[PDB]
């Protein structure tokens, strides 16, 4: 069992909602819009979770 | 965080940053510098590795 393989990755923490989230992003690169997939290199082996 | 080398922008805060327009347009960093100055964002260069 890989512990880091089954854990809820927290994306956004809720606030009062007043005002609702206002995310302004000047860049439109996909890593900034949709997020990027950081990898773990274990013994020269690339693996993500 | 301990391995972030500063740049011209970081050393220029609270002071005066003097650049070269020919250098900006020739090196292709004009758009990145403009979005850095307008928005406030700075992105230290990261290798793809």
Coordinates of C-alpha atoms in Angstrom, one line a residue:
Chain A
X1 CA 0.0 0.0 0.0
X2 CA 1.4 3.4 -1.0
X3 CA 0.2 6.0 1.5
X4 CA 0.8 9.0 -0.9
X5 CA -1.2 7.1 -3.5
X6 CA -4.5 7.2 -1.6
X7 CA -4.9 10.7 0.1
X8 CA -7.2 13.5 -0.8
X9 CA -5.1 16.3 -2.3
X10 CA -6.6 19.5 -1.0
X11 CA -7.2 21.9 -3.9
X12 CA -9.3 24.8 -2.5
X13 CA -10.2 25.7 1.1
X14 CA -13.7 27.2 1.5
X15 CA -14.1 30.8 2.7
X16 CA -17.1 32.9 3.8
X17 CA -17.9 33.3 0.1
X18 CA -18.4 37.0 0.5
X19 CA -17.0 37.8 -2.0
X20 CA -16.9 34.5 -3.9
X21 CA -13.5 33.4 -5.2
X22 CA -12.2 35.9 -7.8
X23 CA -9.3 34.3 -9.6
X24 CA -7.6 36.6 -12.0
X25 CA -4.8 35.0 -14.0
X26 CA -2.9 37.0 -16.6
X27 CA -1.0 34.0 -18.0
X28 CA -3.1 31.4 -19.9
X29 CA -0.5 28.7 -20.0
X30 CA -2.1 25.3 -19.3
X31 CA 0.1 24.6 -16.2
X32 CA -1.3 27.8 -14.6
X33 CA -4.9 27.3 -15.8
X34 CA -5.5 23.5 -15.3
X35 CA -2.6 23.0 -12.9
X36 CA 0.6 21.0 -13.4
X37 CA 1.5 17.4 -12.6
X38 CA 4.5 17.4 -10.3
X39 CA 6.4 14.0 -10.4
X40 CA 8.4 12.0 -8.0
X41 CA 11.6 10.5 -9.3
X42 CA 12.3 7.4 -7.2
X43 CA 15.6 5.7 -8.2
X44 CA 15.5 7.2 -11.7
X45 CA 11.9 6.2 -12.1
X46 CA 9.3 8.9 -12.8
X47 CA 6.0 8.3 -10.9
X48 CA 3.2 10.6 -10.0
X49 CA 0.2 10.2 -7.7
Chain B
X1 CA 13.3 28.3 -0.9
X2 CA 16.9 28.4 0.2
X3 CA 18.2 28.0 -3.3
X4 CA 16.4 30.9 -5.0
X5 CA 18.9 33.2 -6.6
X6 CA 17.9 36.9 -6.7
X7 CA 17.6 38.8 -10.0
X8 CA 17.7 42.4 -11.2
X9 CA 14.0 42.9 -10.3
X10 CA 14.6 41.6 -6.8
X11 CA 17.6 43.9 -6.2
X12 CA 15.7 46.8 -7.8
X13 CA 12.8 46.9 -5.3
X14 CA 12.6 50.3 -3.6
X15 CA 15.1 51.7 -6.2
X16 CA 15.5 52.2 -9.9
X17 CA 15.8 49.4 -12.5
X18 CA 17.5 50.6 -15.7
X19 CA 17.2 48.1 -18.6
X20 CA 17.9 48.2 -22.4
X21 CA 15.0 48.1 -24.8
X22 CA 17.2 46.6 -27.5
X23 CA 18.2 43.9 -25.0
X24 CA 14.6 43.3 -24.0
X25 CA 13.3 42.9 -27.6
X26 CA 16.4 40.9 -28.7
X27 CA 16.4 38.4 -25.9
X28 CA 12.6 37.8 -26.1
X29 CA 12.0 38.6 -22.5
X30 CA 9.9 41.7 -23.2
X31 CA 6.5 40.1 -22.8
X32 CA 7.5 38.2 -19.7
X33 CA 9.0 41.4 -18.1
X34 CA 5.9 43.4 -19.1
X35 CA 3.5 40.9 -17.5
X36 CA 5.8 40.8 -14.5
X37 CA 5.7 44.6 -14.1
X38 CA 2.0 45.0 -14.8
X39 CA 0.7 42.1 -12.6
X40 CA 3.4 41.8 -9.9
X41 CA 4.2 38.2 -10.7
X42 CA 7.8 37.1 -11.0
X43 CA 8.9 33.7 -12.2
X44 CA 12.5 32.6 -11.5
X45 CA 13.8 30.4 -14.3
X46 CA 13.2 26.7 -13.7
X47 CA 14.9 24.0 -15.7
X48 CA 12.6 21.4 -17.3
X49 CA 14.5 18.6 -15.4

